Write a protein that binds this ligand. Structure first.
Ligand SMILES: CCCCCCCCCCCCCCCCCC(=O)OC[C@H](COP(=O)([O-])OCC(O)COP(=O)([O-])OC[C@@H](COC(=O)CCCCCCCCCCCCCCCCC)OC(=O)CCCCCCCCCCCCCCCCC)OC(=O)CCCCCCCCCCCCCCCCC
Ligand SMILES: CCCCCCCCCCCCCCCCCC(=O)OC[C@H](COP(=O)([O-])OCC[N+](C)(C)C)OC(=O)CCCCCCCCCCCCCCCCC
Ligand SMILES: CCCCCCCCCCCCCCCCCC(=O)OC[C@H](COP(=O)([O-])OCC[N+](C)(C)C)OC(=O)CCCCCCCCCCCCCCCCC
Ligand SMILES: CCCCCCCCCCCCCCCCCC(=O)OC[C@H](COP(=O)([O-])OCC[N+](C)(C)C)OC(=O)CCCCCCCCCCCCCCCCC
Ligand SMILES: NC(=O)C1=CN([C@@H]2O[C@H](COP(=O)(O)OP(=O)(O)OC[C@H]3O[C@@H](n4cnc5c(N)ncnc54)[C@H](OP(=O)(O)O)[C@@H]3O)[C@@H](O)[C@H]2O)C=CC1
Ligand SMILES: CCCCCCCCCCC[C@H](O)CC(=O)SCCNC(=O)CCNC(=O)[C@H](O)C(C)(C)COP(=O)(O)O
Ligand code: SF4
Ligand code: SF4
Ligand code: SF4
Ligand SMILES: [Zn+2]
Lengths: 45, 42, 115, 342, 96, 155, 209, 388, 56, 48, 176
């Protein structure tokens, strides 16, 4: 019988992510200010 | 032999007051100073 | 070498001077300790305890031993003043819970084997 | 001595004192101190309890592992007494109650329960019994409490003739119901006292003195069949004593002469409370009574104890009753009260 | 087998039981004395003696690496049995 | 009789007291982290009503999780005294139980039960968060069987 | 390397540390009593107690030493010596990626100079040495107990201090506080005599008396 | 009328990181000086070790930094092996590095999440303590204990990894960066977290060096120093990773350093998983490491050596060493003296938290009371190793 | 893994990432709690000759 | 245990018991060793 | 190799400055934090229903101690005292003598479970697999005294837990 201990798989393990991943999401500041201004305008009207 | 302000002191060193040992375990104890005997088993 | 270096005092009179200063400080501190820690003892009792603690070391003749005793006494005084000690620490000088141990030969013989 | 009962050690918590004590009434004021003094020296303490086991928890750190044993018991059941008494060489009777209940009157706790304990202890073969009666115990007393105390002394000596009867005066301590009782009168305005308290003289004793005296009576071979009076060092007129209590607590002291009959009516009104009455007719009678003098009895000084004065231990009792204004005041700011002597 | 003391206390397999005057029996009151009722001496006494046909036999306690250190037992004495000093199993040569 | 009402009232009060066991975080040593692991999502001590509490004035149980040293014992007794009643003490780990690895040290008190009365002794070094949770539920079952009002009714 | 069990010896670092030890001994003959390199390439400088501040300052500030970090400062108790206390300075040089050990000695009554002016890290280490060994440090900004209980008597790390000390603590219900009592053990520590009567390491054999 | 509030208390406080008495006087709102009073968890560990055999002293190190158990026992094992002149096997070294990085993940999770919880962000504590529970499961599967493994020993490790453990470690690690992302999604850019950490507890690099600081407390001030790279131990020289370096030396930079250290720990763990070699897991020298139980029950020499190693222990050649590792809390070291017997003559334990907490007064200068809570949290302090 | 499509979408959007591929709760991906017996290798000095302890 | 039952032993408890702490079935420790020193018993016969 | 953690300078143009002004005035990263917590609210909790569900352990788990027997019912302990010698906490107290049948057996075997550190060194030292740490971890007691184990207590633990103790040992002995 051959030896049998805890070993990596023959092809190794798949890659593991470690780098930071904070996705970019949202609109630009121009869009936010335009929306905020238009909301107030319609409210006023 | 060195600039340490050599102060004359008696040659009866007594550190009992600084050891923190309770007074019962200084005067009443009796220590034995010896080279241990060889264990006759070995 | 033949001689040794001092801690602070180069002589026995200097050691006595510092001992007297420490005794003064402790004697003045005792009433504030009694008030602040809310001790159930009297100021006379506390000052007599301070004196009896000082009298334990009256047999010391080495100025360096006297200096180290003064250093440790000032340390204890600073623990008492700054209220680093609790009431239990101040009250440990008075062994109120420990029973009166025997002193004569006969009672020690009666209670056990210890000399 | 049985081989397991030989004293060993140095009198500390892990030592063996040779004492196996069942302390009836160990969950009370006096009981917690004798239990502590027994566990200090490494005694085997058997604690009979009828209360909720939560109420015995303060006694658990009083002795080394295995040295404090808790066992349920029923005062009206001799089998429970026998069970908690079988293996002890000394029995201490401390059970009492300053008021009658719907199930236990003064005769039950001061006559029947002590007689049962004494008789069961004699039958089981315990060498020593310490019974705690009152100094003022009297068969013709105005108090049911003291009349029953006298009857119980008779019954205990009849059942256990080698018993040591100890008769303390009004014991004071941190949870005493004597200094706290008088200090608790500030809640009803002034301090009512029959005849202004100028005819009552008290000789209170300190709790630690009583407990050390009980321990010494255990250890003293010449205490069998003896009766002790555990009185304090000084006698005080009740007015002077209460004045000193209020001065130490720093509360304003304004007494007034409530007569005897009105005070008995007050006590009767308080008995309606079904939880630890603040006062009773019996307590009103026993407060107004003077302590007797029994010079023929051995006392705390015949057991090797110097009685502690009130003016030394009153601050450790009354500092709880001081307001924030006077909470941090020395014990000597109040001069000692006037003492009446013999 | 687990017996009883004259006081009624149960006697352990080490032969322990407080005497009638020992105050320490108060620890078992309103409780129980913990005694293992499987006396190993009586259990190993119940095992048969193996009739192995050799002067020297080996015993490791059974289960190979899960037993005890393997020891060798001499079986030349015809009055005694050779027993293992680890697990107590006894061995003897066939019918002398 | 009137002992049925007292029994029901005792049952109600003891259900309310064990359903809101608010403990005090006395984390002295390694046993503190297994106790916040019993706090963690996997065991979620809050699901039993056992909240994360604060100053002893709103705490019902003291958990002594770690070695008690001589320097530290007066503070432990102080905060134990400051707990309103009813209050309970759980000794968690060998150090708090009987000294543990440091039993023979000059600076370690051999068991917190020399300082405070202890209700539950949780063994282990450290006890697993599940072991501490078992001790907590065992304390709850201790509270369930109290008979304070039935003791009072027979006084 | 047909010796997979023996720790490999690195002779280049041994030579480098030997040369630097010679360098340090030559620059400060006034204080250096002995310098040696272990078989695992660790360099020690044995100095007179007077040279603590000069040697430490030189090792910190010299451009060829740059030992900017005080890794550890401890004491060792050897009762068979008249100067029983051995003060050990462990220093690290980030610039040269090297470590050095500086050792001196003292007894119960001679003060060692405080090195807080050389390393700010020494403030608590010297307090700890004073606490556990009783060694006084002159000119220490704040010397007092750091590890032991307030009012603790003795210095526990001395070899003649008992393992469980002299006092226990427990809560006493009569006096309503934690009290201190002489130590009693329900089970005393069981002393084991483990040393073999046969010599293990011939290379460390001391010459016979 | 100088009545600077001398609030000299706070051990029972939940933010006291366990047991800490702080003696504090404030000039009104701001801190003037901090006086840490320690020793509330001093158990005489270093004296007790003198009464213990070398194997018997190993579990003491699990309980020094009881957030980084396996790193402490690795440091002690390295010291004892250096004194013994023996070498642990390659597989044991790879296992030690893998579990040291797992331990660094555990410690950094505890440090960052308890820092945030003290500041008032309680939520990230639970999310990451679930991952801590999973790593506790890894610890227990390798050793039988969740925290105090006593697994890394002088000579190697106690026993080999069970089958399927590497697969589970891989499954955990492949998802862990997503949890670091969620932790950063709550703290890193938050204008309240930065307001509590930016420019708080700033320490100068030279002043960090002179105060004996190590680890993140050094690299927060821009010092490019890491023991795993400058003075590598085990198989750390064969593993690739990055050392995150700060620029402002404040609490925020140290927090970023710890988070990026978690990421680099994942990066190291991946290589440890992929490069685990075959072979034994303790030195094949039965006078240091005990033989396999099967040989102990069959072979005379193995039985003798098992007996002697478990009663007397191995003798260590006389000598003293100072060996230090890059612990998750900084440089953890031991000054181990051997007199030639089977018990250590002296064992001084160097804990980074001791020097770091010695610098609390310096770093709290001119800061509010709420900033001292952050400064204590950024020095991550376990008093088991501060007091020993 | 039992969450509905709509709830998965809501939480993916709220977190800003697809959290269904990196669930923090373990499932059948873990290794079996019963494993085959191991067969561990021997060290370099498990030799019958050329193995004197004075050389190692 | 349905698919892989435990190995039968005659000394294994056939009835599992839960934690009996706080019950009269609780374990109480005692010394399992016998008395070390035997005292001298005096004769029952008087000398006089 | 190293990397910088906070060495990025913000861009200073119209669009970036307006982005940061909108982030300042409209609290956008605070909204990201709210979104993260909202996303966690809709995730299945990691809580298990204790005691009906239990935390996962391994055969190596070190819990309550037990003394084991051979299949014959004979004790395994032959009182070598190796476990007592190696015990880091000195939690093991042993007395032995020849048994009436001549066997080398203990008469005292105590484990102070409040001294114990549960390190498992005793079961490593044992040459006959007599002393083990079992799987049990729910044995909290209401008093300190029930944690000072006896030889009878430990043997009853062995008889109580042997069925699963033996299975755990069979699962892990090939690693030992
Ligand atoms: C505002 C609320 C609007 C209605 C919400 C309805 C809801 O959540 O239905 C569940 C249903 C499934 O939710 P999930 O988290 O994907 O479920 C995971 C498993 O499928 C879940 O699988 P499962 O096998 O666990 O499903 C069984 C489950 C199924 O439970 C339900 O369907 C609950 C429905 C509640 C209405 O029922 C139980 O477990 C029985 C216990 C029920 C506990 C109490 C339920 C609410 C009581 C409300 C007060 C009543 C008075 O919700 C949706 O499909 C999404 C609704 C989104 C609404 C807008 C956002 C809020
Ligand atoms: C008329 C005055 C009667 C005063 C009786 C008394 O002292 O009661 C104390 C007690 C108060 O005792 P307490 O202050 O311990 O509070 C008791 C309530 N628990 C237990 C819930 C905390 O009085 C009562 O409880 C009411 C009793 C009836 C009062 C009216 C009696 C009329 C006759
Ligand atoms: C929102 C909340 C709204 C109000 C909710 C009210 C709920 C009322 C239900 C019962 C509440 C608890 C009553 C018992 C108090 C706690 C307790 O266990 O006391 C034990 C105690 C035990 O007394 P004891 O005399 O046996 O012990 C005291 C002395 N030591 C501690 C030294 C032993 O009971 C009492 O003091 C008497 C209680 C009388 C009965 C009260 C009934 C309820 C009254 C209110 C309705
Ligand atoms: C209370 C009810 C509202 C609660 C907060 C909004 C919902 C939060 C959960 C869902 C959103 C999750 C985060 C997200 O999508 O962020 C997108 C983005 C994330 O942006 P960012 O932080 O990545 O920055 C990118 C955009 N620049 C560079 C320009 C700053 O945030 C937004 O879109 C926020 C828009 C709304 C801002 C707040 C308005 C408050 C006033 C409302 C009326 C009163
Ligand atoms: N205190 C004093 O000033 C004086 C006291 N004495 C005597 O000293 C002894 C102790 O007094 P002290 O400790 O202050 O009293 P407490 O009332 O504080 O304690 C009385 C004790 O008796 C128990 N007890 C009372 N009634 C019963 C009952 N029916 N059945 C069972 N147990 C009962 C109580 O148990 P539980 O708490 O569960 O009810 C408690 O343990 C008593 O004999 C008393 O009369 C004598 C002179 C003066
Ligand atoms: C609040 C309750 C109390 C709480 C606090 C209780 C303790 C308070 C005191 C704590 C300190 C303790 O006293 C120890 C110290 O300081 S020791 C100083 C040296 N002590 C000597 O004795 C030196 C040698 N002695 C002599 O030379 C002479 O004998 C003497 C000076 C005594 C008289 O000189 P004189 O000219 O005859
Ligand atoms: S019992 Fe163990 S884990 Fe708990 S505090 Fe003590 S040493 Fe640490
Ligand atoms: S587990 Fe460790 S501490 Fe506990 S008895 Fe065994 S060897 Fe001693
Ligand atoms: S349990 Fe094992 S190691 Fe301990 S004495 Fe018995 S045989 Fe020896
Ligand atoms: Zn056999």
């Amino acid at each position: 019988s051959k030896v049998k201990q805890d070993m990596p798989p023959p092809g190794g393990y798949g890659p593991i992510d470690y780098k930071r991943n904070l996705p970019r999401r949202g609109l630009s500041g121009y869009s936010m200010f335009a929306v905020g201004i238009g909301t107030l305008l319609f409210g006023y009207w | 032999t060195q600039d340490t302000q050599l102060i004359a002191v008696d040659e009866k060193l007594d550190i009992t007051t600084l050891t923190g040992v309770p007074e019962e375990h200084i005067k009443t104890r009796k220590v034995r100073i010896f080279v241990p005997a060889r264990n006759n088993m070995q | 070498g033949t001689s040794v270096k001092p801690i602070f005092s180069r002589d026995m009179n200097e050691a006595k001077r510092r001992v007297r200063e420490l005794y003064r400080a402790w004697y003045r501190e005792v009433p504030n300790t009694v008030h602040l820690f809310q001790l159930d003892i009297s100021v006379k009792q506390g000052r007599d305890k301070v004196r009896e603690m000082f009298m334990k070391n009256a047999h010391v003749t080495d100025p360096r031993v006297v200096d180290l005793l003064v250093i440790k006494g000032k340390m204890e005084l600073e623990e008492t003043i700054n209220v680093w000690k609790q009431r239990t620490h101040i009250m440990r000088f008075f062994h109120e819970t420990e029973a009166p141990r025997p002193t004569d030969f006969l009672s020690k013989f009666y209670v056990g084997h210890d000399p | 001595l049985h081989h397991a009962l030989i004293p060993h050690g140095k009198g500390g918590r892990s030592s063996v004192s040779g004492i196996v004590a069942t302390v009836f009434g160990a969950t009370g004021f006096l009981g917690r101190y004798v239990v502590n003094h027994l566990g200090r020296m490494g005694s085997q303490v058997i604690v009979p309890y009828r209360c909720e086991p939560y109420d015995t928890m303060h006694l658990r750190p009083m002795g080394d592992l295995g040295q404090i044993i808790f066992m349920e018991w029923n005062g009206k059941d001799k089998d429970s007494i026998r069970k908690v008494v079988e293996h002890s060489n000394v029995v201490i009777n401390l059970v009492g109650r300053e008021w009658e209940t719907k199930n236990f009157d003064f005769e039950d706790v001061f006559v029947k329960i002590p007689h049962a304990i004494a008789q069961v202890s004699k039958e089981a073969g315990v060498e020593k019994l310490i019974h705690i009666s009152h100094l003022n115990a009297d068969i013709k007393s105005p108090s049911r409490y003291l009349r029953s105390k006298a009857v119980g002394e008779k019954e205990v000596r009849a059942a256990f003739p080698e018993a040591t009867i100890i008769k303390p005066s009004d014991i004071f301590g941190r949870e005493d119901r004597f200094l706290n009782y008088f200090a608790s009168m500030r809640w009803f305005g002034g301090v009512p006292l029959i005849s202004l308290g100028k005819e009552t003289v008290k000789q209170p004793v300190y709790i630690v003195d009583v407990s050390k005296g009980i321990i010494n009576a255990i250890k003293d071979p010449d205490a069998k069949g003896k009766t002790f009076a555990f009185v304090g060092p000084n006698r005080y007129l009740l007015f002077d004593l209460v004045q000193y209590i209020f001065a130490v607590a720093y509360r304003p002291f304004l007494p007034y002469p409530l007569p005897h009959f009105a005070y008995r009516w007050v006590g009767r009104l308080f008995e309606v409370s079904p939880f630890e009455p603040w006062t009773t007719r019996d307590k009103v009678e026993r407060v107004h009574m003077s302590d007797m003098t029994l010079p023929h009895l051995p006392g705390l000084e015949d057991l090797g104890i110097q009685a502690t004065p009130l003016e030394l231990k009153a601050i450790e009792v009354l500092r709880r009753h001081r307001t924030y204004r006077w909470l941090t005041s020395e014990m000597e700011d109040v001069k000692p009260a006037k003492t009446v002597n013999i | 087998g687990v017996r009883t003391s004259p006081t009624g206390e149960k006697v352990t397999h080490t032969g322990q039981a407080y005497d009638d005057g020992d105050y320490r029996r108060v620890r078992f009151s309103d409780r129980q004395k913990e005694v293992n009722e499987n006396f190993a001496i009586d259990l190993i006494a119940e095992q048969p003696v193996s009739e192995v046909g050799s002067r020297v036999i080996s015993c490791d306690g059974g289960g190979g690496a899960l037993g005890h250190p393997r020891v060798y037992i001499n079986l030349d004495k015809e009055t005694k049995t050779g027993t293992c000093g680890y697990c107590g199993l006894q061995f003897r040569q066939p019918h002398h | 009789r009137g002992e049925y009402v007292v029994a029901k009232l005792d049952d109600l009060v003891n259900w309310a007291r064990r359903s809101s066991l608010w403990p005090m975080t006395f984390g002295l040593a390694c046993c503190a982290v297994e106790m916040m692991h019993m706090a963690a999502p996997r065991y979620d001590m809050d699901r039993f009503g056992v909240v994360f509490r604060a100053s002893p004035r709103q705490s019902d149980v003291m958990i002594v999780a770690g070695t008690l040293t001589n320097k530290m014992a007066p503070a432990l007794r102080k905060v134990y005294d400051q707990m309103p009643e009813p209050r309970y003490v759980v000794s968690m780990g060998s150090c708090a139980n009987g000294g543990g690895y440091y039993h023979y040290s000059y600076s370690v008190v051999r068991g917190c039960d020399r300082i405070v009365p202890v209700d539950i002794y949780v063994p282990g070094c450290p006890p697993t968060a599940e072991a501490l949770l078992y001790g907590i539920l065992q304390l709850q079952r201790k509270i369930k069987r109290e008979k304070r009002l039935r003791i009072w009714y027979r006084r | 390397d047909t010796r997979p069990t023996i720790r490999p010896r690195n002779d280049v670092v041994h030579k480098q540390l030997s040369a630097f030890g010679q360098y340090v001994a030559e620059i400060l003959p006034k204080y250096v009593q002995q310098v040696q390199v272990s078989c695992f390439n660790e360099l020690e400088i044995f100095i007179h107690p007077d040279g603590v501040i000069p040697v430490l300052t030189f090792l910190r500030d010299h451009t060829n030493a740059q030992f900017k970090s005080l890794a550890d400062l401890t004491a060792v108790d050897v009762p068979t010596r008249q100067n029983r206390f051995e003060i050990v300075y462990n220093l690290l040089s980030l610039r040269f990626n090297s470590r050095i050990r500086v050792k001196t000695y003292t007894d119960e009554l001679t003060p060692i100079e405080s090195s807080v002016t050389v390393y700010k890290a020494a403030n608590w280490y010297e307090r700890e040495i004073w606490d556990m060994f009783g060694v006084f440090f002159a000119n220490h900004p704040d010397l007092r107990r750091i590890l032991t209980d307030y009012g603790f008597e003795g210095h526990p790390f001395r070899k003649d201090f008992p393992l469980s000390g002299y006092v226990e603590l427990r809560y006493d219900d009569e006096v309503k506080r934690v009290v201190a009592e002489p130590v009693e053990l329900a089970q005393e520590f069981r002393k084991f005599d483990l040393n073999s009567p046969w010599e293990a390491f011939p290379a460390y054999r001391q010459p016979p008396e | 009328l100088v009545s600077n509030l001398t609030l000299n208390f706070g051990p029972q406080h939940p933010a006291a990181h366990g047991v800490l008495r702080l003696v504090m006087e404030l000039s009104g709102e701001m801190v003037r000086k901090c006086d840490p009073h320690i020793g509330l968890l001093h158990r005489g560990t270093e004296k007790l070790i003198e009464y213990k055999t070398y194997l018997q002293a190993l579990p003491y190190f699990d309980r020094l930094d009881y957030v980084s158990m396996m790193c402490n026992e690795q440091a002690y094992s390295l010291a004892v092996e250096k004194l013994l002149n023996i070498q642990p096997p390659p597989r044991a070294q790879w296992i030690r590095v893998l579990f040291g990085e797992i331990t660094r993940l555990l410690n950094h999770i505890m440090a960052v999440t308890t820092h945030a919880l003290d500041i008032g962000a309680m939520t990230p504590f639970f999310w990451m303590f679930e991952e801590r529970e999973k790593m506790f499961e890894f610890y227990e599967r390798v050793s039988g204990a969740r925290m105090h493994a006593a697994y890394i020993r002088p000579g190697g490790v106690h026993q080999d990894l069970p089958l399927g453990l590497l697969d589970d470690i891989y499954e955990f690690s492949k998802n862990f960066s997503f949890r670091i992302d969620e932790l950063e999604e709550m703290l890193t850019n938050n204008r309240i977290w930065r307001n509590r950490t930016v420019d708080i507890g700033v320490v100068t690099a030279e002043d960090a060096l002179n105060y004996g600081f190590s680890g993140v407390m050094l690299r927060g001030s821009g010092i490019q120093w890491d023991l795993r790279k400058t003075q590598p131990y085990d198989v750390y020289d064969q593993v690739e990773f990055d050392v995150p370096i700060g620029s402002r030396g404040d609490c925020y930079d140290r927090y970023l350093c710890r988070v990026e250290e978690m990421r680099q720990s994942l990066r190291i763990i991946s290589q440890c998983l992929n490069k685990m070699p075959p072979g034994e897991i303790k030195v094949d020298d039965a006078k240091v490491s005990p033989p396999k139980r099967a040989e102990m029950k069959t072979s005379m020499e193995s039985l003798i050596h098992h007996f002697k190693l478990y009663t007397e222990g191995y003798q260590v050649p006389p000598g003293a060493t100072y060996t230090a590792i890059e612990a998750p809390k900084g440089e953890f070291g031991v000054y181990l003296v051997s007199d030639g017997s089977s018990r250590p003559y002296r064992c001084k334990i160097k804990a980074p938290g001791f020097a770091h907490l010695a610098g609390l007064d310096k770093m709290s200068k001119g800061h509010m009371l709420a900033d001292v809570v952050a400064i204590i949290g950024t020095q991550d302090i376990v008093f088991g190793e501060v007091d020993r | 893994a039992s969450a509905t499509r709509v709830i998965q979408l809501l939480r993916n959007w709220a977190s800003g990432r697809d959290l269904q591929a990196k669930l923090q709760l373990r499932y059948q991906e873990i290794s079996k709690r019963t494993q085959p017996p191991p067969k561990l290798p021997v060290g370099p000095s498990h030799k019958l000759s050329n193995n004197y302890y004075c050389t190692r | 245990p349905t698919t892989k039952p435990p190995t039968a032993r005659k000394y294994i408890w056939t009835n599992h018991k839960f934690n009996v702490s706080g019950t009269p079935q609780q374990y109480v420790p005692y010394s399992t060793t016998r008395k070390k020193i035997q005292e001298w018993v005096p004769p029952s016969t008087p000398y006089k | 190799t190293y990397k910088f953690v906070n060495m990025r300078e913000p861009s200073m143009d119209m669009k970036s400055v307006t982005d940061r002004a909108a982030q300042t005035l409209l609290w956008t990263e605070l909204v990201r934090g709210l979104g993260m917590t909202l996303s966690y609210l809709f995730r299945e909790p990691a809580t298990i229903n204790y005691p009906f569900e239990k935390g996962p352990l391994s055969p190596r788990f070190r819990g309550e101690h037990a003394l084991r027997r051979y299949p014959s019912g004979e004790e395994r302990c032959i009182a070598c005292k190796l476990c007592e010698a190696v015990c880091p906490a000195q939690a093991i107290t042993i007395e032995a003598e020849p048994r009436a049948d001549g066997s080398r057996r203990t008469t005292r075997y105590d484990i102070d479970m409040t001294k114990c550190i549960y390190c498992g060194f005793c079961q490593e030292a044992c040459p006959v697999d007599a002393i083990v740490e079992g799987p049990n971890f729910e044995f909290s007691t209401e008093t300190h005294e029930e944690l000072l184990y006896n030889k009878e207590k430990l043997l009853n633990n062995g008889d109580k837990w042997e069925a699963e103790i033996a299975a755990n040992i069979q699962a892990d002995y090939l690693y030992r």
